[model samples]
Target: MQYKLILNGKTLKGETTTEAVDAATAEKVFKQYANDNGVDGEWTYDDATKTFTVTE
Candidate 1:
């Protein structure tokens, strides 16, 4: 579990979402949030790259 998610062109733990008691929780919560809301781009993480992306 990690805060490896990026929302749209903005990295989370930014203005859109911030790290909660744990980054995992934050990312997970935000993961479903953006996806369910249809507001932001999307959550992405190739793992090989080591960081998530929400690029539309």
Candidate 2:
């Protein structure tokens, strides 16, 4: 399944919701989105703090 990341209520990464991609790619895009947005903080998923400052 492909997952997209959103920041500040905006869709920062990923294209469509139906398309699927690899987990690594999703993570990479999410991170890139965060970096591009100048997110220096950490993102939280479930209970884990991710490298990206925003993600789904």
Candidate 3:
């Protein structure tokens, strides 16, 4: 599974630059980021596209 963090109008691959991560790690990072950034969003994975979607 690949993860994507979409924030501040940008998309980040994961904690490490340009690297895809597992779903659990991705969800962890997303939750932490939302807390730290004072934002609300949902993390969803698309099996058809094999991509994670973030909406704020």
lDDT of each: 0.56, 0.47, 0.54
Q: Which residue pairs in candidate 3 have backbone atoms (N, alpha carbon, C) closer than 3 angstroms, thus clashing?
A: none
lDDT of 2 by residue, 1-56 (tens): 53544454244443322122655666666666566766534465431422222533
Q: TM-scores for all candidates?
A: 0.42, 0.47, 0.46
List model 1 lDDT by residue over 1-56, tens digit each: 34455555444332253445665666677667666755466456564634556765
- With a 3 Å backbone cut-off (N, CA, C), the pairs that clash in candidate 2 are none
* Model 1 alpha-carbon drift over 4 Å, by segment: 1-6, 9-15, 39-53
Order of candidates by lDDT, top first? 1, 3, 2
Candidate 1: lDDT over CA atoms?
0.56
Write the number of the candidate with greater lDDT, choosing between 1 and 2: 1
Model 1: worst 10 consecutive residues (lDDT sum):
9-18
lDDT of 3 at 49: 49
- Residue 21's C-alpha lDDT in candidate 3? 59
Q: Residue-wise lDDT of candidate 3 within 9-56, one digit each (tens)?
A: 244433322244566676676677666766555656665644555555
